[PDB]
C-alpha cells in the first residue's frame, strides 16, 4: 500500500501590535459636531476611548508598521532575507506614507503596502501581497499564509494589518464614534513539531446587505461652509435595520463549519478570540457556539473598533494575560462588510508576544 501525503504544520511564531499614542474620550471635542449622541449610545457599543493616528507626530499606517515589524523581526531573531512572503491588509483605500522607498509620495490610492514595506524592511526574498477582507483580513492573511506553508511554497510568512480608518470617518455623523486606528504584525512559519498548527478554517460571503456599510465618495452628513467631497464610511440606516439577525448567526455558521472540518466540537475549545464590533454581537456569537463568558474577552473598551486589527489585538491580549496558554486550542472568528465571515480552529504552541 502507498503512503498518504502530509501538509506541513503551521506555527504561529510571533505577534505584536502598535496602537496610536493619543486616546480620545467619548466627550473629546473631536465629536463636537456629532448629532444624536447620548449616554445610552456610548454604553451600548462599549467604546470608552479610542486612538487616532496623528500624522503631524509621524504616526501613519506605514510608520507604525515599520516599528512593529522591525521589533518583531528583532525579538524573534528573524533575518529579513529569510521571509518568503509578506501579506498586508489595510481597510482604508487611502494611504499616506511610503517611508524611504517613495519619499515624495503623499496621499495615494495605490500602490498598497506590501511591496514598499518589503523594501523598507529588507525582505529581499519576500513575495509581496495585499489582500482585502475588511475586518476579517487578519484571518484571511493567516489562511493564505497557512496554505502556502502547508503546501511547501513558503517557510516564513510575515502578516500585516494596518488600519487608518480615521481618515474615512465623517465627524459630522455618529458613524465616526466607534472605529479606531491600529496596527498588527504576525509571523507564521513551518512548524518543526506537532505543537502548533491551523487545524481547519471556514470562510463564506453573502452580498445581500452589501449596500449597508460602504465607503462612498460624498459630502459630509451635516456639512458646514463649502465642504469638499471625501471618501467617507457610509451607513444605510434603513437597510441595516432589515439585517437584524444576519451577522449574529453567520459567524457561528462559520465557526461550526470550521470545527466540523477539524473534527472537533465547541467542548474541545479552550478559548475564543472574536472580532470586537459590539459587546452584544460578541456575546451573540459566543452564545451561538456555546462559549462561556470566561472563555473570551471584550477589548474594544480602550481601543475602539479597529477593523481587522481587533482580532489580532485580542489574541495578543489573551496571550499576554495568560488566558491563552501554550497547548490551548482556540477559535478565531469575526464578520466583515461585504459581507464576509471567517473562522479558524488553531492548535497553539508557544507564541512570542513582543
Amino acid at each position: 500500500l502507498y503512503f498518504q501525503g502530509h501538509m506541513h504544520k503551521v506555527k504561529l511564531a510571533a505577534i505584536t501590535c502598535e496602537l496610536p499614542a493619543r486616546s480620545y474620550e467619548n466627550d473629546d471635542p473631536v465629536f463636537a459636531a456629532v448629532p444624536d449622541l447620548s449616554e445610552s449610545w456610548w454604553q451600548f457599543w462599549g467604546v470608552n476611548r479610542r486612538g487616532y493616528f496623528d500624522p503631524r507626530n509621524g504616526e501613519n499606517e506605514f510608520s507604525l508598521v515599520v516599528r512593529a515589524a522591525e521589533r518583531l523581526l528583532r525579538s524573534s531573531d528573524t533575518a529579513p532575507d529569510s521571509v518568503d512572503m509578506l501579506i498586508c491588509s489595510a481597510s482604508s483605500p487611502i494611504m499616506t506614507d511610503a517611508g524611504d522607498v517613495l519619499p515624495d509620495l503623499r496621499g495615494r490610492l495605490y500602490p498598497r503596502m506590501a511591496n514598499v514595506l518589503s523594501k523598507q524592511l529588507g525582505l529581499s526574498r519576500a513575495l509581496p501581497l495585499d489582500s482585502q477582507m475588511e475586518a476579517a483580513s487578519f484571518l484571511l492573511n493567516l489562511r493564505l499564509a497557512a496554505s502556502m506553508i502547508r503546501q511547501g511554497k513558503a517557510e516564513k510568512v510575515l502578516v500585516v494589518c494596518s488600519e487608518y480608518i480615521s481618515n474615512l470617518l465623517d465627524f459630522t455623523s455618529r458613524t465616526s464614534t466607534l472605529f479606531a486606528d491600529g496596527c498588527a504584525v504576525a509571523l507564521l512559519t513551518r512548524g518543526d513539531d506537532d505543537s502548533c498548527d491551523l487545524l481547519a478554517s471556514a470562510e463564506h460571503s453573502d452580498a445581500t446587505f452589501y449596500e449597508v456599510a460602504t465607503g462612498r465618495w460624498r459630502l459630509p452628513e451635516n456639512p458646514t461652509g463649502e465642504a469638499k467631497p471625501r471618501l467617507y464610511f457610509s451607513l444605510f440606516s434603513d437597510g441595516q435595520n432589515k439585517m437584524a439577525s444576519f451577522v449574529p448567526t453567520n459567524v457561528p455558521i462559520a465557526m461550526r463549519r470550521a470545527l466540523e472540518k477539524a473534527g472537533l466540537g465547541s467542548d474541545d475549545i479552550d478559548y475564543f478570540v472574536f472580532h470586537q464590533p459590539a459587546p452584544f454581537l460578541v456575546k451573540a456569537w459566543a452564545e451561538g457556539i456555546g462559549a462561556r463568558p470566561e472563555q473570551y474577552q471584550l477589548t474594544m473598551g480602550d481601543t475602539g473598533v479597529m477593523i481587522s486589527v481587533s482580532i489580532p489585538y485580542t489574541l495578543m491580549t489573551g496571550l499576554r494575560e495568560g488566558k491563552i496558554r501554550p497547548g490551548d486550542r482556540i477559535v478565531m472568528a469575526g464578520a466583515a462588510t461585504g459581507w464576509g465571515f471567517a473562522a479558524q480552529v488553531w492548535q497553539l504552541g508557544e507564541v512570542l508576544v513582543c
Binding site: 503623499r106 498598497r112 482585502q132 452580498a207 452589501y210
Partner: protein, 280 residues
C-alpha cells in the same frame, strides 16, 4: 490551476494618447460602470464551462478603479467582488480582493488557497472603469477599461515566477503610482492621477522581461499582457485584457498547458504562472 473558460467584455470606444508610454486603449464613457461589462463577461465564461453561479466556491477580484464600479457610481468599497456575488447569485461563494496584484500572482495565490480548501470552481475577475482616474498626459500611460473573467479549477500545481525587467540592468525603473486628488470639488471629479514617468525603453524592457521569464519553462507556450502601444499594430493595446484572445487561440489549437505572464507596474517586475487549459 486549470482555466475552464474565459470571458471578456471591452468598451468599443478607444482613446489614443501620445507619448512613449501611450497607445490606443479602450476607455469607458460617461457614467458607464464596471459591472455593465463584468457581469456579461462572467456569464459568458460560466456558460462556456456549463457552470452555474451557485456552484462558484470563490470569487477574487482585481480592480483599481476608485469609482464607477456599480449602479451607485460613487461607491468604492467593499470591492466589486461582493456586488458581483449578489447579482450573480453565487450564494455559496467566498469573496475577497487582491487589490494591486497582477493576474499571474493572484492566480498563483488563489490556486494555493482554493486547492487547500477543496474548492472546485473558482472565479478570478479583472476589470477597470477608470473615469475616476486622470491619465498621465506627459507619458501617455493609461489603464485599459473592460472586464476579464477566468473561471478556474484549482489543482495546487501552478508554478510561479517573479522576474526582473529586461534592458539595462543598472537602470532603475520608476514605478507607477496613483496619488490621491487633493482638490476634489464635485463628487464626479477624478479621485486620483495616474503617474508613470515617461521612460522610452520601458515597453521593450517589459517584453524582454517576458521572454526571460518564459525561459524558465521552455516546454510551454505563453501569453502576455500588453500595457503599451509602442511597436504594436495601430498603437493599440488592451493591457491585461489581451490575454482573452491569446487564451482563446490556445484553446483553438488544443493546448493542454500554458504559461501566463503579467506586468506589475507598481513593482516594475514581470510575473508568470503555469496553467492548464480545457478544450474549446
Amino acid at each position: 490551476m486549470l482555466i475552464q473558460a474565459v470571458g471578456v467584455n471591452l468598451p468599443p470606444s478607444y482613446v489614443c494618447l501620445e507619448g512613449p508610454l501611450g497607445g490606443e486603449r479602450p476607455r469607458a464613457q460617461g457614467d458607464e460602470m464596471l459591472m455593465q461589462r463584468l457581469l456579461p463577461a462572467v456569464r459568458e465564461a460560466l456558460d462556456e464551462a456549463a457552470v452555474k453561479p451557485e456552484e462558484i466556491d470563490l470569487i477574487v477580484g482585481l480592480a483599481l478603479s476608485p469609482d464607477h464600479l456599480i449602479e451607485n457610481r460613487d461607491i468604492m468599497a467593499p470591492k466589486i467582488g461582493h456586488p458581483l456575488q449578489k447579482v450573480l447569485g453565487a450564494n455559496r461563494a467566498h469573496v475577497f480582493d487582491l487589490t494591486d496584484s497582477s493576474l499571474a500572482r493572484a492566480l498563483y495565490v488563489v490556486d494555493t488557497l482554493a486547492s487547500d480548501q477543496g474548492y472546485r470552481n473558482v472565479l478570478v475577475v479583472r476589470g477597470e472603469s477608470s473615469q475616476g482616474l486622470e491619465v498621465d498626459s506627459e507619458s501617455g500611460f493609461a489603464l485599459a477599461d473592460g472586464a476579464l473573467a477566468l473561471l478556474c479549477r484549482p489543482t495546487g500545481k501552478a508554478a510561479f515566477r517573479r522576474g526582473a525587467l529586461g534592458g539595462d540592468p543598472a537602470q532603475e525603473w520608476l514605478p507607477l503610482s496613483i496619488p490621491l486628488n487633493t482638490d476634489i470639488r464635485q463628487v464626479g471629479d477624478v479621485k486620483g492621477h495616474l503617474n508613470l514617468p515617461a521612460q522610452p525603453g520601458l515597453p521593450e524592457a517589459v517584453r524582454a522581461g517576458f521572454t526571460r521569464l518564459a525561459g524558465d519553462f521552455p516546454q510551454l507556450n505563453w501569453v502576455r499582457e500588453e500595457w503599451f502601444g509602442q511597436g504594436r499594430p495601430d498603437g493599440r493595446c488592451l493591457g491585461p485584457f489581451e490575454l482573452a484572445s491569446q487564451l482563446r487561440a490556445a484553446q483553438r489549437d488544443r493546448l493542454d498547458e500554458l504559461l501566463l505572464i503579467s506586468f506589475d507596474p507598481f513593482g516594475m517586475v514581470v510575473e508568470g504562472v503555469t496553467l492548464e487549459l480545457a478544450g474549446e
